[PDB]
Structure 1
Amino acid sequence: VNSFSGYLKLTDNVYIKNADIVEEAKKVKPTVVVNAANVYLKHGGGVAGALNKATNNAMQVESDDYIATNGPLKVGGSCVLSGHNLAKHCLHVVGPNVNKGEDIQLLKSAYENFNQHEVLLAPLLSAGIFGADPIHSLRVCVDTVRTNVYLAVFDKNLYDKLVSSFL
Structure 2
Amino acid sequence: VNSFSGYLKLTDNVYIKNADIVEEAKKVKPTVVVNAANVYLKHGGGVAGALNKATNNAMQVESDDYIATNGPLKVGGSCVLSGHNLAKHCLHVVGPNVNKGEDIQLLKSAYENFNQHEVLLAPLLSAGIFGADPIHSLRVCVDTVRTNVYLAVFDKNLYDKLVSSFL
Deviation, structure 1 residue 32: 0.0
* Secondary structure in 1 matching 2:34: strand
User: Which secondary structure does the structure 2 equivalent of 1:120 belong to?
Assistant: strand
With normalisation by structure 2, the TM-score equals: 1.00
1:130 offset after TM fit, Å? 0.1
* 4+ residue segments displaced more than 6 Å: none
1:138 counterpart residue number = 138
Query: How many Å separate the matches in 1 of 2:20 and 2:132?
Result: 19
- Deviation at residue 33 of structure 1 after TM alignment: 0.0
Distance 1:155 1:101 in 2: 25
- Alpha-carbon distance, 1:128 to partner: 0.0
Give the CA deviation at 1:108. 0.1
Unaligned segments of structure 2, at least 5 residues: none
Q: What's the offset of the Cα at 1:96?
A: 0.1
Q: Deviations for 1:70-127, whole angstroms, at most 9, x for unmatched residues?
A: 0000000000000000000000000000000000000000000000000000000000
In 1, the alpha carbon distance for the partners of 2:82 and 2:27 equals: 17
For residue 42 of structure 1, give the secondary structure of its aligned residue in structure 2. Answer: coil
User: How far apart are the structure 2 equivalents of 1:154 and 1:41?
Assistant: 21
Q: In 1, Cα distance between the equivalents of 2:29 and 2:99?
A: 32
CA RMSD across the alignment? 0.1
Any unmatched runs of 5+ in structure 1?
A: none
1:134: Cα distance to partner?
0.1
Work out the CA distance in 2 between the residues paired with 1:22 and 1:157: 19
**Secondary structure at 2:96's aligned position in 1?**
coil
Deviations along 1:22-60, one digit per CA (max 9) or x if unpaired, are 000000000000000000000000000000000000000
